[PDB]
């Protein structure tokens, strides 16, 4: 209806508040955890490692390794059968600070012009060594000879603080069959 990003606060400020409140201490241990402050030096705060398209009817896997050659992905084509149901699986790692409202943004092009925009909220996550996973609700691919064709996508991962965590390009082809 409106919404506005809350003021910023470090992990230190969050941990130091209500330091005598027993339930809030457990609350923080459940959400942020306790023990060794583990970090991977030489790594941004977010790092999205791969985006997969869960398609039960598809023959082989249709994924994108985001740690690899982005320039080949920019030139490659992922095939999606018209009208098929799918879910997108994201793998990523939060490093030092909390990520508020991490989200995926996509600008779709056809014949060189922008024809569609789409996004999906991944959420807010706390920093930890182990990677997180995220699946969006089931979606259906476009259907019809009007929608069938090749699209050029410009994707990126941003957040409530407008920080670009990743940007890349890839091509999508919606066809009558997997081939």
């Amino acid at each position: 209806g409106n919404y506005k990003p809350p003021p910023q606060k470090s992990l230190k400020e969050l941990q130091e508040m209500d330091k005598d409140d027993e339930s809030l201490i457990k609350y923080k241990k459940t959400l942020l955890g306790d023990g060794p402050v583990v970090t991977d030096p030489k790594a941004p705060n977010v790092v999205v490692t791969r985006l997969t398209l869960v398609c039960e009817s598809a023959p082989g896997p249709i994924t994108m390794d985001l740690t690899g050659d982005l320039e080949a992905l920019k030139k490659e084509t992922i095939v999606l059968k018209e009208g098929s149901e799918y879910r997108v699986k994201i793998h990523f790692k939060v490093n030092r600070d909390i990520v508020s409202g991490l989200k995926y943004v996509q600008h779709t092009y056809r014949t060189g012009v922008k024809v569609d925009k789409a996004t999906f909220m991944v959420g807010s996550y706390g920093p930890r060594p182990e990677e997180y996973e995220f699946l969006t609700p089931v979606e259906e691919a476009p259907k019809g000879m009007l929608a069938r064709g090749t699209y050029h996508n410009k994707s990126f991962f941003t957040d409530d603080d407008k920080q670009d965590h990743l940007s890349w390009e890839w091509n999508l082809s919606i066809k009558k069959e997997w081939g």
């Binding site: 919404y3 606060k9 209500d18 339930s23 809030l24 959400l31 909390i98 959420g123 807010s124």
Partner: protein, 181 residues
Amino acid sequence: MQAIKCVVVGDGAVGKTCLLISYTTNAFPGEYIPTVFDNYSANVMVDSKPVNLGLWDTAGQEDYDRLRPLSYPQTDVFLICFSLVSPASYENVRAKWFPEVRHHCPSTPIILVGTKLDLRDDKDTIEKLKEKKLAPITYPQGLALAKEIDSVKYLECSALTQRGLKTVFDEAIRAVLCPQP
């Protein structure tokens, strides 16, 4: 068998913790009430259906606006609470809670819950509100807010007397088991 995650949000003092403690322990606190209840799971039956309901309380303070949303991921159903004797908590749903829950989780079902139902008829509570030129939230007013936020269900309960309390959690489950695509 089945796993359903439920998160409870709303203003401080509306009764989020008492609602969860009263429901899970079968007794109203009325003594020491922690700021936030610990995470517990209720093994419930809903018409031959084995459901494991994980419950999550939240720190409503503005100070935790950055930490609280970390519990939102993978939530199947939200309980947005407001006190039936607090118009301010009611408007906070419009100005804060609904926008926050929708920003982080655009498709997850919402159940609007009116708390402290036992106090709506309380003479002293009513007179105190009238002194400040306020009145309790009536059923039509609550139902009107539910429509404005497109909630799946509007329910009123009392953790103190337990009236309609169990119904709140049964509906949270039915919102997931019988959705709408």
